[PDB]
């Protein structure tokens, strides 16, 4: 009956070692997401600025 416990424990360790990797990958992805998000916001600001400036030039002409 040990041959079953062996399978259980091997499967356990095997899939643990993989779950850790998956989680890690997800974490890295989150980091990527926020890291870009900051830049997106920067783009929002820069864009709004551009918009206002263009409106001003429109007013000038």
């Amino acid at each position: 009956m040990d041959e079953i416990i062996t399978r259980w424990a091997t499967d356990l360790a095997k899939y643990q070692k993989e779950f850790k990797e998956q989680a890690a990958k997800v974490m890295e992805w989150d980091r990527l997401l926020v890291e870009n998000g900051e830049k997106i916001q920067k783009l929002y600001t820069s864009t709004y600025e551009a918009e206002r400036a263009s409106n001003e030039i429109e007013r000038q002409l």
Binding site: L12, Q22, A23
Partner: protein
């Protein structure tokens, strides 16, 4: 020592958190002054929580308990839900430009 390993394996594959062996923490960003909230729940060891808070990547981040697979699935669900929002906002920017 047979009915112990079995119970321990039954314990490993479970969301009850008796040494779940699928214990990883993910840091969810939360702006101040909401840091004082959260605040774990049912089966959180302050050890794990604090140890998570210990190696903090940046301030305004709170750790999140990912026990097993449905949790990482859920994390993915959120990640897509934000993916679409990201793309949308980005397209807005594109359009205004």
């Amino acid at each position: 020592p047979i009915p112990e390993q079995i119970k321990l394996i039954v314990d490993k594959w479970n969301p009850n958190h008796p040494n779940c062996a699928f214990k990883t923490y993910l840091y969810n960003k939360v702006d101040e002054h909401t840091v004082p909230l959260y605040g774990p729940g049912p089966n959180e060891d302050p050890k794990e929580w604090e140890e998570a808070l210990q190696r903090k990547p940046a301030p305004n981040f709170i750790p999140v308990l990912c026990s097993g697979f449905p949790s990482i699935v859920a994390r993915l669900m959120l990640q897509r839900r934000v993916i679409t929002e990201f793309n949308n906002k980005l397209h807005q920017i594109n359009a205004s430009l």
